[PDB]
Design an enzyme around this catalytic site. Structure first.
Site, mmCIF file in Angstrom:
data_model
loop_
_atom_site.group_PDB
_atom_site.id
_atom_site.type_symbol
_atom_site.label_atom_id
_atom_site.label_comp_id
_atom_site.label_asym_id
_atom_site.label_seq_id
_atom_site.Cartn_x
_atom_site.Cartn_y
_atom_site.Cartn_z
ATOM 1 N N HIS A 53 0.804 -1.360 0.186
ATOM 2 C CA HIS A 53 0.047 -0.089 -0.081
ATOM 3 C C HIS A 53 0.611 1.074 0.140
ATOM 4 C CE1 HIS A 53 -3.351 -2.729 1.309
ATOM 5 N NE2 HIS A 53 -2.703 -3.338 2.106
ATOM 6 N N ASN A 179 4.360 -10.296 9.802
ATOM 7 C CA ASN A 179 3.044 -10.307 10.637
ATOM 8 C C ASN A 179 2.917 -10.867 12.063
ATOM 9 O OD1 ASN A 179 0.069 -11.814 10.911
ATOM 10 N ND2 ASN A 179 -0.056 -10.001 10.179
ATOM 11 N N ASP A 188 -0.205 -3.641 15.041
ATOM 12 C CA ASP A 188 -1.085 -3.277 13.861
ATOM 13 C C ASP A 188 -2.432 -3.690 13.799
ATOM 14 O OD1 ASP A 188 -1.522 -3.693 11.139
ATOM 15 O OD2 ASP A 188 0.228 -3.114 10.646
ATOM 16 N N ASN A 189 -2.373 -5.169 13.910
ATOM 17 C CA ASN A 189 -3.834 -5.817 13.558
ATOM 18 C C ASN A 189 -4.862 -5.228 14.376
ATOM 19 O OD1 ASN A 189 -2.752 -8.865 11.895
ATOM 20 N ND2 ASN A 189 -1.539 -7.100 12.338
ATOM 21 N N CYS A 193 -6.536 -1.264 13.240
ATOM 22 C CA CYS A 193 -8.103 -1.352 12.827
ATOM 23 C C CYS A 193 -9.097 -0.793 13.889
ATOM 24 C CB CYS A 193 -8.525 -2.883 12.562
ATOM 25 S SG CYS A 193 -7.649 -3.775 11.251
ATOM 26 N N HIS A 299 -7.594 -8.760 3.951
ATOM 27 C CA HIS A 299 -6.531 -8.439 2.699
ATOM 28 C C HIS A 299 -7.228 -8.513 1.515
ATOM 29 C CE1 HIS A 299 -2.536 -7.194 0.908
ATOM 30 N NE2 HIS A 299 -2.907 -8.418 -0.022
ATOM 31 N N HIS A 351 -4.033 2.546 8.639
ATOM 32 C CA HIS A 351 -3.732 2.754 10.203
ATOM 33 C C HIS A 351 -2.852 3.910 10.061
ATOM 34 C CE1 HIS A 351 -3.922 -1.744 10.691
ATOM 35 N NE2 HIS A 351 -5.018 -1.337 10.415
ATOM 36 N N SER A 359 5.243 -2.031 12.806
ATOM 37 C CA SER A 359 5.159 -2.916 11.476
ATOM 38 C C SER A 359 6.444 -2.726 10.841
ATOM 39 C CB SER A 359 3.769 -2.851 10.943
ATOM 40 O OG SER A 359 2.877 -2.768 11.627
HETATM 41 N N1 LIG Z 1 -6.780 -4.145 6.416
HETATM 42 C C1 LIG Z 1 -5.965 -4.046 7.327
HETATM 43 O O1 LIG Z 1 -5.204 -3.027 7.603
HETATM 44 C C2 LIG Z 1 -5.622 -5.381 7.964
HETATM 45 C C3 LIG Z 1 -4.671 -5.238 8.945
HETATM 46 C C4 LIG Z 1 -3.886 -6.731 9.317
HETATM 47 C C5 LIG Z 1 -4.551 -7.739 8.833
HETATM 48 N N2 LIG Z 1 -5.351 -7.520 7.733
HETATM 49 C C6 LIG Z 1 -5.950 -9.002 7.051
HETATM 50 O O2 LIG Z 1 -7.074 -9.261 7.703
HETATM 51 C C7 LIG Z 1 -7.547 -10.629 7.919
HETATM 52 C C8 LIG Z 1 -7.702 -11.164 8.955
HETATM 53 O O3 LIG Z 1 -6.345 -10.715 9.952
HETATM 54 P P1 LIG Z 1 -5.950 -11.423 11.331
HETATM 55 O O4 LIG Z 1 -4.599 -11.092 11.604
HETATM 56 O O5 LIG Z 1 -6.992 -11.037 12.158
HETATM 57 O O6 LIG Z 1 -6.351 -13.265 10.983
HETATM 58 P P2 LIG Z 1 -6.766 -14.036 12.375
HETATM 59 O O7 LIG Z 1 -6.339 -15.459 11.712
HETATM 60 O O8 LIG Z 1 -6.087 -13.835 13.546
HETATM 61 O O9 LIG Z 1 -8.597 -13.560 12.245
HETATM 62 C C9 LIG Z 1 -9.119 -14.263 11.402
HETATM 63 C C10 LIG Z 1 -10.370 -14.989 12.069
HETATM 64 O O10 LIG Z 1 -11.267 -15.338 11.081
HETATM 65 C C11 LIG Z 1 -12.012 -16.579 11.739
HETATM 66 N N3 LIG Z 1 -12.643 -17.131 10.569
HETATM 67 C C12 LIG Z 1 -11.926 -17.757 9.446
HETATM 68 N N4 LIG Z 1 -13.049 -18.182 8.283
HETATM 69 C C13 LIG Z 1 -14.228 -17.633 9.189
HETATM 70 C C14 LIG Z 1 -15.507 -17.928 8.754
HETATM 71 N N5 LIG Z 1 -15.974 -18.686 7.566
HETATM 72 N N6 LIG Z 1 -16.506 -17.339 9.354
HETATM 73 C C15 LIG Z 1 -16.186 -16.504 10.655
HETATM 74 N N7 LIG Z 1 -14.877 -16.451 11.126
HETATM 75 C C16 LIG Z 1 -13.954 -17.021 10.379
HETATM 76 C C17 LIG Z 1 -10.739 -17.425 12.282
HETATM 77 O O11 LIG Z 1 -11.342 -18.250 13.094
HETATM 78 C C18 LIG Z 1 -9.835 -16.257 12.675
HETATM 79 O O12 LIG Z 1 -10.023 -16.519 14.212
HETATM 80 C C19 LIG Z 1 -6.356 -11.039 7.022
HETATM 81 O O13 LIG Z 1 -6.733 -11.271 5.538
HETATM 82 C C20 LIG Z 1 -5.287 -10.231 7.125
HETATM 83 O O14 LIG Z 1 -4.340 -10.273 6.002
HETATM 84 C C21 LIG Z 1 -5.897 -6.700 7.357
HETATM 85 N N1 LIG Z 2 -1.497 3.360 6.520
HETATM 86 C C1 LIG Z 2 -0.791 2.013 5.991
HETATM 87 N N2 LIG Z 2 0.057 1.805 5.469
HETATM 88 C C2 LIG Z 2 0.599 0.799 5.031
HETATM 89 N N3 LIG Z 2 0.143 -0.349 5.233
HETATM 90 C C3 LIG Z 2 -0.983 -0.270 6.105
HETATM 91 C C4 LIG Z 2 -1.509 0.901 6.438
HETATM 92 N N4 LIG Z 2 -2.766 0.388 7.236
HETATM 93 C C5 LIG Z 2 -2.550 -0.764 7.286
HETATM 94 N N5 LIG Z 2 -1.690 -1.225 6.460
HETATM 95 C C6 LIG Z 2 -1.332 -2.837 6.396
HETATM 96 O O1 LIG Z 2 -2.143 -3.495 5.346
HETATM 97 C C7 LIG Z 2 -1.866 -4.680 5.377
HETATM 98 C C8 LIG Z 2 -3.040 -5.599 4.890
HETATM 99 O O2 LIG Z 2 -2.686 -5.598 3.618
HETATM 100 C C9 LIG Z 2 -2.067 -4.914 7.203
HETATM 101 O O3 LIG Z 2 -1.416 -6.116 7.330
HETATM 102 C C10 LIG Z 2 -1.336 -3.495 7.695
HETATM 103 O O4 LIG Z 2 -0.039 -3.999 8.115
HETATM 104 NA NA NA Z 3 -1.401 8.471 7.662
#
Ligand SMILES: NC(=O)c1ccc[n+]([C@@H]2O[C@H](COP(=O)([O-])OP(=O)(O)OC[C@H]3O[C@@H](n4cnc5c(N)ncnc54)[C@H](O)[C@@H]3O)[C@@H](O)[C@H]2O)c1
Ligand SMILES: Nc1ncnc2c1ncn2[C@@H]1O[C@H](CO)[C@@H](O)[C@H]1O
Ligand code: NA
Ligand SMILES: NC(=O)c1ccc[n+]([C@@H]2O[C@H](COP(=O)([O-])OP(=O)(O)OC[C@H]3O[C@@H](n4cnc5c(N)ncnc54)[C@H](O)[C@@H]3O)[C@@H](O)[C@H]2O)c1
Ligand SMILES: NC(=O)c1ccc[n+]([C@@H]2O[C@H](COP(=O)([O-])OP(=O)(O)OC[C@H]3O[C@@H](n4cnc5c(N)ncnc54)[C@H](O)[C@@H]3O)[C@@H](O)[C@H]2O)c1
Ligand SMILES: NC(=O)c1ccc[n+]([C@@H]2O[C@H](COP(=O)([O-])OP(=O)(O)OC[C@H]3O[C@@H](n4cnc5c(N)ncnc54)[C@H](O)[C@@H]3O)[C@@H](O)[C@H]2O)c1
Ligand SMILES: Nc1ncnc2c1ncn2[C@@H]1O[C@H](CO)[C@@H](O)[C@H]1O
Ligand SMILES: Nc1ncnc2c1ncn2[C@@H]1O[C@H](CO)[C@@H](O)[C@H]1O
Ligand SMILES: Nc1ncnc2c1ncn2[C@@H]1O[C@H](CO)[C@@H](O)[C@H]1O
Ligand code: NA
Ligand code: NA
Ligand code: NA
Lengths: 430, 429, 429, 430
Positions: A53, A179, A188-189, A193, A299, A351, A359
């Site tokens: 990103h 991660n 971070d996670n 969020c 993701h 974030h 991170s």
């Molecule tokens: N958008 C962001 O900034 C951000 C940040 C960190 C991680 N992520 C992404 O977020 C997602 C989750 O990450 P995490 O670190 O929380 O993983 P995690 O493994 O800790 O949590 C995911 C959870 O989903 C549950 N799950 C799986 N299938 C399911 C279903 N069908 N119904 C209900 N629950 C179900 C699992 O049991 C698990 O506890 C990943 O794809 C990760 O790459 C996104």
């Molecule tokens: N502002 C940001 N810049 C870069 N990566 C981020 C930001 N916020 C969330 N992410 C990353 O996006 C990933 C999901 O693709 C997460 O694991 C997290 O570390």
């Molecule tokens: Na920022």
């Protein structure tokens, strides 16, 4: 005869730089890496292709890698996550970056392809978030694998894929799972969020959170942070889960844990956090309350059946970029955010910088570890040592005016640990 | 005469889309339309409104017009207008004079455009902060006898109305909308609990977790702001002059101390007092590097912005309504919205659902003053609790709340009217 | 005539130790002693008190006596007396008639012992729930003209006073202590937030985390109970008749529905309404196995305990004030304190610090009625806000709160008296 | 010629049994072990010496072990933690138990010694909480080590000692670390203390929590739960820490993190959670606010310098059992709870039954694992398999009316995991 960079508007660079100046002062971990390593250039000779990103925080990471001696070529790992002013500042600094907000799928692949070839040879290091770069090289360019010293991977879904690749004999390059550094997964996670989910929803919709029912699918680190955020603003949060441990945690925190088949009838806001396919389907959409807001913070965009909405709605009204209001055959409406792609980065700014400094300090340490100490890392998936993980946290305490206690000699003796750590066993869960 | 003045009429279609979404979140206002669009109780009213020209205010405006009023509108803050909302109102034929980023002189000009209608001068005021009220009393007293009533939105504005009355200078009857229970205990509290952080994030994207935040004042706004900041993991310090509010904050786990001490510790500063001289040069000089400083009280009187402009050695505009100052001591201060309301200036203000509570009260107040003026002699009045309860009841269905009804046996036991009101006049909720 | 009647005078030394600790947590009451022990404003008062005979009430009693009053005391609940506290009061020579576990007839006898002093009948009432007030009006009307005033502690009691007045049957002036801000917004809220759980834990030791708890009522008590349960990880469902309180609860993230639905889901049930017929047989029959059912409203009128006693097939006493019933359907119900106030019946009631707020108000009310009776005609009155603020201010030092003082410039700007009161009469905090 | 049991009053048994009946219905995990294993008697031949707080919950554990075929002899692991009615019920059931509330130190050691010798031989299994039994056998009875098939250990301090013993070659018997089952550490240590800390403080002192400053030393699982509890009731919580990761977590949750040297001047309530010596000293006591309440919830009484109070106070006034008010030479008072011993168990009833059902289902599984599958467990310190850990949580979902989602075939394929788990990798931290 290749483009030197491609960004929406390099004229945004001055504004980008002002944002970078602010972020630097929120990112003491990355700044400390610069202070410690700018003279010695531990990453000299490294040619890092980055697929992550293209935000203000990533720009601070990129400039750190360059300060430490690396050459870098960059793309985003999401079509909506680039922050164009940040991309502009990196382009203006003469760093090849290929990223803009609102890429098409063809453009997205094209951008990764622009990062593989440097002046002095192909990439020799991978910095990845989601594994798209990792997979491109393994599938389409296996001839480059032998020249790659290491992969560092940012996210849960990406490291899941690395472990799977390793178990199937497909992985051919040593990787560090960033991660699952404690200072990444537990910060971070979770805390990232807790702030950036609501930010995405609000910038997109301006909806009141208080009084709503919100359904969060999944109660991992992401879902824990999302649920906390929504509860804090006065939503009633319902959790879905497949893991009985995570589900018990949710119950013990005061959330109702039930299935999406039931929760779809009640939710006003739906947030998917699972990393799994087929979470919100047609059968769910048809039962939702009017103007239910539906978004994904996992993701990849695999969790919400957006295809079903496109195929079955009477009409899709675009409200503004990344916000669409579908009118269904039952006369109700669904508000879908970012086409089912990461809502925090797609509808807001991801974030905040402070937690991304945790991170991204891990990312820099992993690049240094893989680049300078390759013997320590055979083909496989590895963790950073706990002493480094602890060093990442310690580097962020000053900014928060935290006063850490030092064990006395007598206490260190009593506990059987060193005064300077590490302070916990390898299995510790924090 | 202009039919309106807005930034960009081309924003009207997007404005309309935002209004469509907001209507579905504003069931109290939509219920006022359902009930009163045919009977038109506001027929004959010429309402001059001075209130943040947002998506939510647009729904209010179109509700007043559905009820038969003629309306002319201005914003009550130079940065709070949402230009797409203003454009939708303009396009609908309603005279609106408002845009984001007015000069002070443009601001007054816009209010002045709302005074005269085709049929005569305004005969009703809908005010947020007292600026329209004060303009008429001070500069256009000849119009006073032609004005049937004022309804006033905000704590600072009602404070002014009570002061005017006590001094014998109030000349038109007013309804205090702020102090309806369904306004003060909802908009001021839960509204700020969401929109303060929205303003701070859109302006700065700062992490809240791990910071010290200092909130000056622990009234309804300060309670909401403090809760918001604490929920994201800031450590919140409170200042207060009132020992009751101070004890409330201490009983909720917050450190309560003076700004003189707290200025040394905060990373984020939010003023909520409604009072002058809250953050001064002597405080700025002591702040942590890149402290973010913002105000959420109605008027920009709480932070000494003049001091920063005069004493900083560098001033850099980061983006609209975000300035970063470098002081002589080498440290930096980030100032939001030039010290004006941060939620409306840097974000979108309170979300539409809670504004439906406030604005249902506003519609009720306008109907009361316009149709029953003899009930309201010159003075400052509240809406009846029965109407206050009706506002809350009108929002229960959207949230799928199931309200219990007393049995006749229970109502007899309690000595309570079975349909309310359910609480005595002094009840504090 | 007995000098007192208590369970065990041998408990006096332990009682005294508990009183010593409580005094140090009750700075408002200790401040009343500091200020008034020499001047003795209550000289001549013969106060009959009917109020839970706890450690906290003992500190109140000894404060009234330090101020010059003669006092005779009874509890206002058959299970709320703390026998060591009663023993300490008895040992100090004060006539107290109270013990934990009174019969209903013993309860009335104890109140009757408080009516006559050496010098004549009572001339002041200090009441919690209206039982003493009602006894005199209904059974001893000949004593009314000799009584200078009543101060009343609790919401149910003041409800009764207003009803009496409206019906023209109130014959003595009363001060409503419940509705001092420093009582209703503190004792009812933060007091229950700690003591509800204390009662449930000492009785049952049940885990709260993971349970569904149903709280009937979302007034000050229900707000405090709900927050407590939610903080330990229960999922809290609320019932309400008032749409404003219901909307508050929904805006805080609670499901609001009827007892008719909620009875199917709760593992814990807490009644906070002050109303009859809240939990009935039709609810019990639907409850999850081993549902815990308790009441924290003043009177035992909320839960149909008669129904369990008549319809259960088994009834086992687990320990004092804990009963486990087996219904015809095979499932079990755990009932606390026979449906009487659970915090005081199964634990120790509210902690001393918050009771210092309530009881400082009580001392002030007694002084107002005794020394300025002409200010208080027959009717129901509030203490002045200035005194209400003084109660909160007297508790700030113990918590190391630093209150800000307005500058004269700020006070002028606000039009506010620099030493208060700082809020208008209608302010809700 | 040895005593068959020793308890305060066996006449309490009928009351104990009523409490046990109630606890059983809160402990579905232990009841499920009874349902599944009462007929097959997997623990037949086992002679388990148990050294663990003799509470109502432990009585349900004991009766489970007996139902599964074990012979058992029991002592408490703390001099104040026994619940005499529960001990009575176990004694009345004919099970040798040696435990009462308020043992002296000599009596405490004597009770453990009563548990070593059975009718048919010495103990052949250890169930321990804090390692006192483990250490007694290794130090004083090394000749019995060869006849012991296994140790299962309940608490963080106890497992710390096992790892240390193993690293120094002192451990001679296979052990299972029950503390670090996910369903123990992340539930008992956290949610248990969130309830039972305040319960201990309130039963002892009846103090108002709201408005106070509370200082919590340590921010591990115990300190996290303690801090949450105190914050929830409106105390302002200040944390001390030595670990920069835990300290950053505390800061990110909104707590001030500073040293005890500073925090002692401000706290009204002090709670030690560290498992370390020398946390609250004379230099701290002398600076505290008047009537500061001081307590410990770490396993051993080593955290508070109680000796300093005994030696330096002008007088110690006993208020009631386990509550002492010391008058210092500065004229201020300190309220010390349970002589610095575990305050939740010493002043109240410890953790509630529901969460102890998670910890104690793990204990039963560990006893079965060590007794029936010894080849799997060489001399060393081991964890239960994740599938069993998940089974413990799943067994508690029904009581909470949790509806767990089942993965579809397609989803299981997509994730690369089995439909029935385990669902997380070994390093997962929950
Ligand atoms: N958008 C962001 O900034 C951000 C940040 C960190 C991680 N992520 C992404 O977020 C997602 C989750 O990450 P995490 O670190 O929380 O993983 P995690 O493994 O800790 O949590 C995911 C959870 O989903 C549950 N799950 C799986 N299938 C399911 C279903 N069908 N119904 C209900 N629950 C179900 C699992 O049991 C698990 O506890 C990943 O794809 C990760 O790459 C996104
Ligand atoms: N502002 C940001 N810049 C870069 N990566 C981020 C930001 N916020 C969330 N992410 C990353 O996006 C990933 C999901 O693709 C997460 O694991 C997290 O570390
Ligand atoms: Na920022
Ligand atoms: N931005 C918004 O959307 C929004 C919403 C509602 C209200 N308001 C405005 O916010 C302000 C506060 O409103 P409110 O409803 O909370 O009023 P309030 O009277 O309930 O609370 C203000 C608090 O400030 C305290 N205070 C006054 N001077 C102080 C000083 N010098 N230092 C410390 N504390 C001091 C008072 O004791 C009081 O408790 C008003 O200006 C009001 O019009 C803004
Ligand atoms: N046990 C204690 O220490 C303690 C402390 C303070 C007050 N009290 C008592 O607690 C009770 C509640 O006091 P309060 O101050 O919260 O009063 P309150 O008037 O603020 O709140 C009671 C709430 O009950 C609701 N209610 C009434 N009947 C209902 C019904 N049938 N179903 C659902 N909701 C209904 C009302 O709408 C109201 O909001 C009173 O009896 C009071 O005397 C007890
Ligand atoms: N009383 C109970 O019911 C209960 C329940 C579970 C565990 N325990 C006991 O509680 C204690 C803590 O257990 P845990 O599971 O939380 O362990 P932990 O290892 O997770 O937490 C202890 C924390 O103390 C911190 N620490 C160590 N020395 C310190 C010092 N000098 N100053 C400040 N912080 C320091 C460490 O960095 C660590 O984070 C152990 O003794 C354990 O056996 C008690
Ligand atoms: N989105 C909004 N639209 C209109 N007025 C708002 C909005 N958010 C907050 N306000 C109002 O601004 C007032 C302060 O001027 C508050 O009293 C509040 O009612
Ligand atoms: N510890 C206590 N001592 C005396 N009265 C109390 C205590 N706890 C609660 N109460 C009072 O009981 C009343 C209900 O009868 C409440 O109004 C409250 O003020
Ligand atoms: N009620 C209880 N019964 C038995 N053990 C408990 C109880 N509460 C806490 N514990 C245990 O005490 C141990 C500390 O010795 C903790 O690890 C915890 O598992
Ligand atoms: Na809006
Ligand atoms: Na007490
Ligand atoms: Na128990």
């Amino acid at each position: 005869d290749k483009l030197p960079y491609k960004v929406a508007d390099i004229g945004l660079a001055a504004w980008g730089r002002k944002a970078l100046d602010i972020a630097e002062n929120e990112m003491p971990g990355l700044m400390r890496m610069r202070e410690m390593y700018s003279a010695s250039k531990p990453l000299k000779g490294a040619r890092i292709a980055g697929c992550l990103h293209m935000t203000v925080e990533t720009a601070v990471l990129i400039e750190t890698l360059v300060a430490l001696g690396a050459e870098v070529r960059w793309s985003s790992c999401n079509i909506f996550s680039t922050q164009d002013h940040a991309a502009a500042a990196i382009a203006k600094a003469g760093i090849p970056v290929f990223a803009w907000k609102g890429e098409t799928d063809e453009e997205y692949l094209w951008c990764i392809e622009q990062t593989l070839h440097f002046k002095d040879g192909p990439l020799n290091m991978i910095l990845d978030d989601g594994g798209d770069l990792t997979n491109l090289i393994h599938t389409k360019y296996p001839q480059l694998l032998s020249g790659i010293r290491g992969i560092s991977e940012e996210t849960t879904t990406g490291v899941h894929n690395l472990y799977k690749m390793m178990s199937n004999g497909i992985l051919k390059v040593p990787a560090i799972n960033v991660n699952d550094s404690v200072t990444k997964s537990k910060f971070d996670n979770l805390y990232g969020c807790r702030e950036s989910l609501i930010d995405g929803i609000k910038r997109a919709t301006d909806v009141m959170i208080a009084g709503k029912v919100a359904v969060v699918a999944g109660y991992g680190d992401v879902g824990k942070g999302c649920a906390q955020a929504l509860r804090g603003f006065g939503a009633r949060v319902i959790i879905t889960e497949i893991d009985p441990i995570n589900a018990l945690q949710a119950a013990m925190e005061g959330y109702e844990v039930t299935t999406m088949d039931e929760a779809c009838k009640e939710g006003n806001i739906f947030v998917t956090t699972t990393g799994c396919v087929d979470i919100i389907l047609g059968r769910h959409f048809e039962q939702m309350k009017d103007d239910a807001i539906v978004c994904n913070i996992g993701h990849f965009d695999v969790e919400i059946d957006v295809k079903w909405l496109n195929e079955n709605a009477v009409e899709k009204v675009n409200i503004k970029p990344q916000v669409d209001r579908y009118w269904l055959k039952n006369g109700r409406r669904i508000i879908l955010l970012a086409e089912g792609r990461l809502v925090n980065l797609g509808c807001a700014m991801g974030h905040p910088s402070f937690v991304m400094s945790n991170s991204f300090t891990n990312q820099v340490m992993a690049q240094i570890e893989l680049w300078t100490h390759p013997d320590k890392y055979p083909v496989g998936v590895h963790f950073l040592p706990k002493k480094l993980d602890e060093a990442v946290a310690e580097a962020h305490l000053g900014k928060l005016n935290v006063k850490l206690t030092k064990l006395t000699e007598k206490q260190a003796q009593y506990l059987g640990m060193p005064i300077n750590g590490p302070f916990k066993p390898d299995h510790y869960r924090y």
